[PDB]
Amino acid sequence: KSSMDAFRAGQAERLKQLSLASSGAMETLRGKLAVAENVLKLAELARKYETEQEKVLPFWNGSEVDEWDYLNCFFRRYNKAL
Amino acid sequence: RRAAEREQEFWSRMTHVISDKHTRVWGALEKQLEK
Amino acid sequence: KRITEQFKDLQSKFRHFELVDTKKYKEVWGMKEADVAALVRQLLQADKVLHEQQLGWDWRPPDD
Amino acid sequence: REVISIHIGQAGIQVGNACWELYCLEHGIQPDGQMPSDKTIGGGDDAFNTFFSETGAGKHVPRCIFLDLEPTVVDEVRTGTYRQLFHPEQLISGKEDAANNFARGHYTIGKEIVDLALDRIRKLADNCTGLQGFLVFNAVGGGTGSGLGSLLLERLSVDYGKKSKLGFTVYPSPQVSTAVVEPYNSVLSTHSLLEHTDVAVMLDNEAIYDICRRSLDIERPTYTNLNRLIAQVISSLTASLRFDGALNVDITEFQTNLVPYPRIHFMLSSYAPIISAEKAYHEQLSVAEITNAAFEPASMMVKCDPRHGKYMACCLMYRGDVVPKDVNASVATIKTKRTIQFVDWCPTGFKCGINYQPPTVVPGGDLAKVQRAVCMISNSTAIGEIFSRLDHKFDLMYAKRAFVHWYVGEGMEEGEFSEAREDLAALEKDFEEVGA
Amino acid sequence: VEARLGKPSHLLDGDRLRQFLENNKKVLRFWCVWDERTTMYGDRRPYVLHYYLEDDSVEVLEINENNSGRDPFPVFLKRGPLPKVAVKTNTTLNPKFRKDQCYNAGDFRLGLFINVLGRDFYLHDADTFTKQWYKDNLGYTDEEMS
Amino acid sequence: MREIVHIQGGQCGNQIGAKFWEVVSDEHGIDPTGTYHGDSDLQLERINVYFNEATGGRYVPRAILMDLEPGTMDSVRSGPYGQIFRPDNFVFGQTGAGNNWAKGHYTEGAELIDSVLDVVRKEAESCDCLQGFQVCHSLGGGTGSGMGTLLISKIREEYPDRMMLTFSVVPSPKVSDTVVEPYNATLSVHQLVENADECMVLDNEALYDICFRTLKLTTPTFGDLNHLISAVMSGITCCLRFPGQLNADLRKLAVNLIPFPRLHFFMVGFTPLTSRGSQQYRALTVPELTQQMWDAKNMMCAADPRHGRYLTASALFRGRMSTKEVDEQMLNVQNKNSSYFVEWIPNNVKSSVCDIPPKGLKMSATFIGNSTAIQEMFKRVSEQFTAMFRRKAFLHWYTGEGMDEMEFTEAESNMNDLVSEYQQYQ
Amino acid sequence: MREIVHIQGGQCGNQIGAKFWEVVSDEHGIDPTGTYHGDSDLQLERINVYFNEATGGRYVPRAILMDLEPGTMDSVRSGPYGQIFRPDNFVFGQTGAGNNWAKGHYTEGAELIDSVLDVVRKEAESCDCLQGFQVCHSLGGGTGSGMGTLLISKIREEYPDRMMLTFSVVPSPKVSDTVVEPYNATLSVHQLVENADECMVLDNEALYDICFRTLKLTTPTFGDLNHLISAVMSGITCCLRFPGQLNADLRKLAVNLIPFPRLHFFMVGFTPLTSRGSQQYRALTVPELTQQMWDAKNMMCAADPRHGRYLTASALFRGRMSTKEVDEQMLNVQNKNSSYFVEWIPNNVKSSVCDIPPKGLKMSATFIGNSTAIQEMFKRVSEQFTAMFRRKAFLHWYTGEGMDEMEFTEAESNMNDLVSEYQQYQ
Amino acid sequence: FQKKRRLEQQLEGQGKAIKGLTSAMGRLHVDLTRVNGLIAANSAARQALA
Amino acid sequence: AKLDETISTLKLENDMVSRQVKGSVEAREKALVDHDVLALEVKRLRDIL
Numbered sequence A: 001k002s003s004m005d006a007f008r009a010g011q012a013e014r015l016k017q018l019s020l021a022s023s024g025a026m027e028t029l030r031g032k033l034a035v036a037e038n039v040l041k042l043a044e045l046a047r048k049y050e051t052e053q054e055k056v057l058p059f060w061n062g063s064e065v066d067e068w069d070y071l072n073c074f075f076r077r078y079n080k081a082l
Numbered sequence B: 001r002r003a004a005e006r007e008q009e010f011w012s013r014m015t016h017v018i019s020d021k022h023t024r025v026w027g028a029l030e031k032q033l034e035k
Numbered sequence C: 001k002r003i004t005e006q007f008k009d010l011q012s013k014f015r016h017f018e019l020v021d022t023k024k025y026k027e028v029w030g031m032k033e034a035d036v037a038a039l040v041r042q043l044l045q046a047d048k049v050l051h052e053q054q055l056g057w058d059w060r061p062p063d064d
Numbered sequence D: 001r002e003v004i005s006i007h008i009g010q011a012g013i014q015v016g017n018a019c020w021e022l023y024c025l026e027h028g029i030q031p032d033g034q035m036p037s038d039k040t041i042g043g044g045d046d047a048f049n050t051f052f053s054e055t056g057a058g059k060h061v062p063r064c065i066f067l068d069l070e071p072t073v074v075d076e077v078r079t080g081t082y083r084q085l086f087h088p089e090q091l092i093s094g095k096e097d098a099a100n101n102f103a104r105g106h107y108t109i110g111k112e113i114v115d116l117a118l119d120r121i122r123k124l125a126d127n128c129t130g131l132q133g134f135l136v137f138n139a140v141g142g143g144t145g146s147g148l149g150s151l152l153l154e155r156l157s158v159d160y161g162k163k164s165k166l167g168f169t170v171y172p173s174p175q176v177s178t179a180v181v182e183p184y185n186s187v188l189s190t191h192s193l194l195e196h197t198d199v200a201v202m203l204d205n206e207a208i209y210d211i212c213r214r215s216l217d218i219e220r221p222t223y224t225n226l227n228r229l230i231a232q233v234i235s236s237l238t239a240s241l242r243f244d245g246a247l248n249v250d251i252t253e254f255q256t257n258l259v260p261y262p263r264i265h266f267m268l269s270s271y272a273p274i275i276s277a278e279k280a281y282h283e284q285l286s287v288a289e290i291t292n293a294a295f296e297p298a299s300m301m302v303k304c305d306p307r308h309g310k311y312m313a314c315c316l317m318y319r320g321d322v323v324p325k326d327v328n329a330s331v332a333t334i335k336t337k338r339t340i341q342f343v344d345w346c347p348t349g350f351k352c353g354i355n356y357q358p359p360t361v362v363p364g365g366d367l368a369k370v371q372r373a374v375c376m377i378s379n380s381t382a383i384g385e386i387f388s389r390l391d392h393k394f395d396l397m398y399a400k401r402a403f404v405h406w407y408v409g410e411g412m413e414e415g416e417f418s419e420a421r422e423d424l425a426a427l428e429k430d431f432e433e434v435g436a
Numbered sequence E: 001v002e003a004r005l006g007k008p009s010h011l012l013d014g015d016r017l018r019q020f021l022e023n024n025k026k027v028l029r030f031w032c033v034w035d036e037r038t039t040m041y042g043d044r045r046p047y048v049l050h051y052y053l054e055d056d057s058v059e060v061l062e063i064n065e066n067n068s069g070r071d072p073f074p075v076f077l078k079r080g081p082l083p084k085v086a087v088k089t090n091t092t093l094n095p096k097f098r099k100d101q102c103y104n105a106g107d108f109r110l111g112l113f114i115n116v117l118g119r120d121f122y123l124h125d126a127d128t129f130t131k132q133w134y135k136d137n138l139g140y141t142d143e144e145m146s
Numbered sequence F, G: 001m002r003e004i005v006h007i008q009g010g011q012c013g014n015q016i017g018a019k020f021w022e023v024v025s026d027e028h029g030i031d032p033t034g035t036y037h038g039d040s041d042l043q044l045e046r047i048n049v050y051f052n053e054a055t056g057g058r059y060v061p062r063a064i065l066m067d068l069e070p071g072t073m074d075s076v077r078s079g080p081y082g083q084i085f086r087p088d089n090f091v092f093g094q095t096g097a098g099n100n101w102a103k104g105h106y107t108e109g110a111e112l113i114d115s116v117l118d119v120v121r122k123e124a125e126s127c128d129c130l131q132g133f134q135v136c137h138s139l140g141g142g143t144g145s146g147m148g149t150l151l152i153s154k155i156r157e158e159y160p161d162r163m164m165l166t167f168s169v170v171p172s173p174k175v176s177d178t179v180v181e182p183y184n185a186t187l188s189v190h191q192l193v194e195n196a197d198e199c200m201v202l203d204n205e206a207l208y209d210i211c212f213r214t215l216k217l218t219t220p221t222f223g224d225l226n227h228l229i230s231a232v233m234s235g236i237t238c239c240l241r242f243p244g245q246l247n248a249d250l251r252k253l254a255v256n257l258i259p260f261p262r263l264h265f266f267m268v269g270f271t272p273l274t275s276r277g278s279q280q281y282r283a284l285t286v287p288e289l290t291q292q293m294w295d296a297k298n299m300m301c302a303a304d305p306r307h308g309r310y311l312t313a314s315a316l317f318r319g320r321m322s323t324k325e326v327d328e329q330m331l332n333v334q335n336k337n338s339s340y341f342v343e344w345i346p347n348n349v350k351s352s353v354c355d356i357p358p359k360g361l362k363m364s365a366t367f368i369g370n371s372t373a374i375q376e377m378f379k380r381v382s383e384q385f386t387a388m389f390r391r392k393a394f395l396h397w398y399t400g401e402g403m404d405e406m407e408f409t410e411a412e413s414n415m416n417d418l419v420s421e422y423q424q425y426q
Numbered sequence H: 001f002q003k004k005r006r007l008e009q010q011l012e013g014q015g016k017a018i019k020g021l022t023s024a025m026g027r028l029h030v031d032l033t034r035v036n037g038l039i040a041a042n043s044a045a046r047q048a049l050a
Numbered sequence I: 001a002k003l004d005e006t007i008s009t010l011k012l013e014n015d016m017v018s019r020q021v022k023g024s025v026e027a028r029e030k031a032l033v034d035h036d037v038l039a040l041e042v043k044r045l046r047d048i049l
């Protein structure tokens, strides 16, 4: 009976800990996804007032990508609008 | 033991597949595109 | 006599809970790892479109 | 289903003087011994069986004895307004005082009167048929109540044994005091009270003074008000036997639900609603607020903070129009409340009882008539805190051997002083151990 | 709704405390005789009846004679409002008896018959306090109270 | 013909039984005087099951009061329909249990059990065809749990071939009335698994919230509380006392309800239940009755059935109805929520019908379920037991009369066995 | 057979439904005690679409009142015919929406919609054939908008294939009772443009104008306006409850009126609406009713049709008339006002007749038009929204409760593209 | 005071988490019932079509 | 004296809230497990569909 109770308690504890850790991870990933979809929609929102000129050419008339110059194209579009 | 550590690396992979660099990019792009 | 079968019935009961509990934990883990795989696939899809449309110039999948 | 009451010492006799007038007002008995011919309030015949036994043709007598060596208070009772109520043989009056000396009250004059007292109690119990328990009333801070009370308790225990013993004991206050040898008398009485009395109900004086100042708004109270409200608490406790209700107890549920350990029996008392006649008609009275009122530290009858301790068990008697619902709801709320904490020995530590009889108020009293009331008796470790506080002053006074010459001249010695000291110390040890 | 959100149960119905304050300790006592000698065993028997003016409730007590064949039972009927009438009972909820359905203090006339739960009591005496109360309040003459 | 002998043990048991006898006497149509005043002959032809005619139609209930409280005696005598019981049957002690299972089962029992047994033997031989025993009692008291259990053991020894219904209220921590409830429970439930044939488990909190939302009562006193229990008890013998299209006695109910000898812990419910203010607005029909009965909030136990699976269930219907709709609705409530049943027992539900609805209504039903969810409540009380036993608290009062620790540990062992086998069959 | 569940939201919707239930009950000839006292037997063959028989002639409506204040419930029960509703259907909050859409859709919804959804689920299961739901509410208040939109979203989700009639009264600047009317209306329509299937758009300004000009009442209260709305909201569904020479139910009306899956905002009107002084001095013939039906001043909305074009228009005639006469009248209207009708759809008018007119009158008519002029109100409210939202006025009361900034921008995006879609097909 | 406010805010956060979980419980129960009903319907359809 | 009384009451309130939060933790875990088991049941049922 002692062995049975110990085994059952261990199984319950492992299930509980896996559930808690997985729920935390899933909440983190859901939070990651929430920001992403807001970015996609708001990009769709501003495109309504765009002219088809910049709708067709939003950028202009081989290493990896750094985090400082990372938004140059968007800044070009913003400067065009301004 | 082995299963526990396996799950640990699995969770680390599935929660750091995307970079904090990309998270900061997403936030900054959201602000810039709002303005 | 009564506690003799209770002893063996406990053995049969112990065998039963071993099978049921082990399979239940496996099934829920498989379920939720499939779910998190679907969610991370969705996230990877979301990352690709933001780069490709706004400012990417390149995009690169991970290993797995 | 009768119980027998014995009162020893000045405080005990005065408290009983209040209790018996309260009882006769409850049961409609005139102060001259019989119920009237026209006015009939008796809710049920034989309802007085617990306390009064009819004698022949309409003359009720109490199941109580008053005894004390000082004759002044006893003859005051004899010449008072309740002359015909008592049987002239229960009133035992000595010749000379105990004079704050436990040794004097227990050894010299003790041997003389205890035999007569127990002989009278034996006849009383033999006349009784369904004897339930003993109700002793005394204060250990004096000489008579300590010595004679302890000796009589020991002899009654060795005589009967199995019956329950409820001792409503008045103890010295941390600041309020009227005598000097009270630490000595209290510890000497306690050494035997602990191992004879089944359930000791704590009572203080300063706590009740503060209660009647805060609620009844009387700035300068006397002993009469104290005894009146103590009598009200006793009546609320015995109403379960006296009257009929939807969920009742008797003297045995107390010793069953309230004593987890053979040497841990020290009960905190509380009563609600203590409300004056001015605010009675303006304030809203019901089970939720009376139950909440019965738990604040400023509403218990002994000066000790319940917050420092953790409850063991609580017993709640309800009087009047009370239904099981609102009491269960108040119980759930008080359990989920955090400002009070229960210990893990007993996850289910509430014993509730309900009785249909509303509380009564004596004519000219300081309590207004109300629809319902609640009385609480609880277990905690603040009692052990009180014991440690008293023992500190005991040892500090004893270190200089003060006042010991009276005891040694009476005939006793320092051996039992040492024994009482170590016994009390072991008692605080037991409380602090059980509190874990 | 107020009971749902927390509200005193007695204050839900209300109009209770005035009557208790006005008559906290007023009881009318009547000496009834029940005649059932027409049944097979037992004989006619006296009982007492208390009517509490605090709640308008009725409680019937039984008086025992020495060397009688009856088990000593102090109470004969629990303290409650007497229905005074037949009501179609429900298996789920017991009937709630209201004041106009139950008896009133003016119903007892010292010479009528009371249908207490089928039993047909005949009350024949009353205390002097009850007689004085009746004369004061119901304007009853001295002859009726005889 | 078939005779159910009814015993009332303890304060709770006596007070519930008083209302039960009130309900059954009202159903069979006798005024509290004890004389027959019913209108239809359907009430007379089966009056022998519960009542005995002595002389002059002065019917006397076949009930056995067993306690230690003259106060409860006065209460029973004072309550309406309280004088019908026999003064000979008023077997009562004088001391008082004082809320102690040891006192109720060993000390005072040793002297009063002889009297209770020879009285019960007296009515047992008075009746011609004994059908079974029913005892109404609590589980947390002393004179209700211990004395009733000892009576059960003696009766099982005397008559090994009779069905036994024990109507026992089991405590909950949320509504707690005394302190030694885990001890009293563990002892009584330890004995009832071997002795009692089946037990209808009940509790106070379930009845409380039932009269909260179903009946919409404001001040639900015990007079309101015990009424539902009495209604269920009266309903469980509808087939015995009245004609129907599918008869079912206690043994027939048990055989269809007990797959293994130690699974006889049934949770009960009643339909229809509705407030007084909405009676005229609500329809009366079998689908509505079924939907009301199969809900968890209509159950009289603090055990949520959605936390387990029903091993088996039974329905006792009353009133002129349709067997085809009854069967179709049982099929629906077995098929739609199939996950909450057990897969290796086909036809989990047994249904039966009677021709007479209770007075004051037109169509009724009683639900009885052997479902595995009661292991939650047993786990709860077992935890209460262990927490107090972990340093032997409140235990000197028990050991002061002859109790030991071996039986205390055996009770916990058996409770662990029951909960283990329920979780095994989940 | 076919069934319409009814739901009332907020004070405005609750009072409108309270008047509507009186109107329909009188039309079906039932006593306000729930009993039948009418004469024409044709009333009771189709009362099951709206009523359930409880016990011997007692009928209860198939409606659910929902709000967050007790005053509305007290008023509706104090009013006449308030004793017919089932008390169990009175889902009811306690704290109040405070004219706050965040409160109505995110704070009190999360705690009360679980309760209001189970009861409507039970009511829908009570009937066999579900035809649709009927939600009556406003678009300016808190609980009228937020709670209504949340409930309709849940109902659409759980019944994906059922019709939804939402009677929405919209705010107007000339008749404004609160200050955040655009903030509420835009957010509510943001969900109504996907979830609802047909929104009857109404406003109090047109009702006041009708009561002043053609009705010529001196001091009209809310009761007269609610009674005036009751006429159309009852005549819309007469085709279900009464026979007709050419029947047309809700889905038939929808498939004819709605050309594209987004344009489901209709204006409504009733005929005749004549002052009691002039009732005797005018003739009642279908040609005469057509003029008052197509009069721009008769529309129940402050949107002038002459500033746009009609896409589709439906004519629900009540009484016995000539189908040829109706058809030729509609043909003449279409030919004369050719520019006012869209070009690429031949025969922009649907017609149908029901044999039973409302009592008292022997002839009546109801007009439902899906014209493109209704974008005037959306421009009207969107300009106000932008005016207030440029400064973020009153925006803390919503931001500090659970929504963020971009939701309002999304709502305006949807509003602007909807008016763009109307202008496109114009 | 800072500890007390932190613990309290933890408290209502956990409470709202529990309440959302209970709402999920109810939604899952409703899904269970509807899915089982469809199971029975499709089983009958399978038998008829076979 | 006033500071001491307030401080003692404040520690007691901290203990109250601490164990109340612990109870909330346990309730959240139970709700999570029940959610998991119902989800498993849902997946079995959709597999049958």
Ligand SMILES: Nc1nc2c(ncn2[C@@H]2O[C@H](COP(=O)(O)OP(=O)(O)OP(=O)(O)O)[C@@H](O)[C@H]2O)c(=O)[nH]1
Binding pocket: D008, D009, D010, D011, D012, D014, D015, D068, D070, D097, D098, D099, D100, D101, D139, D140, D141, D142, D143, D144, D145, D146, D170, D177, D178, D179, D204, D205, D223, D224, D226, D227
């Ligand atoms: N509450 C209350 N306490 C009282 C009353 N009378 C006396 N006491 C207390 O009892 C304590 C001890 O009693 P004593 O004054 O010594 O009288 P005693 O107990 O008979 O002892 P002796 O003086 O030797 O006779 C005193 O300190 C008082 O505080 C009373 O009427 N009410």
Ligand SMILES: Nc1nc2c(ncn2[C@@H]2O[C@H](COP(=O)(O)OP(=O)(O)O)[C@@H](O)[C@H]2O)c(=O)[nH]1
Binding pocket: D246, D247, F009, F010, F011, F012, F015, F016, F097, F099, F138, F139, F140, F141, F142, F143, F144, F145, F169, F171, F176, F177, F178, F204, F222, F225, F226
């Ligand atoms: N339903 C119901 N329960 C009761 C009643 N009276 C007592 N109880 C229950 O009985 C339990 C305790 O039983 P107890 O009084 O000790 O039985 P005893 O052995 O006769 O003293 C309590 O939890 C009460 O809830 C009653 O009239 N109705």
Ligand SMILES: Nc1nc2c(ncn2[C@@H]2O[C@H](COP(=O)(O)OP(=O)(O)O)[C@@H](O)[C@H]2O)c(=O)[nH]1
Binding pocket: G009, G010, G011, G012, G013, G015, G016, G097, G099, G138, G140, G141, G142, G143, G144, G145, G169, G171, G176, G177, G178, G204, G222, G223, G225, G226
């Ligand atoms: N037809 C009609 N409209 C009303 C009535 N009462 C209020 N309204 C309209 O409803 C709007 C206010 O909505 P309200 O009922 O307060 O919304 P809620 O507070 O969320 O329920 C106002 O603009 C009024 O024009 C009424 O009795 N009848």
Ligand SMILES: [Mg+2]
Binding pocket: D009, D010, D068, D070, D142, D144
């Ligand atoms: Mg003295």
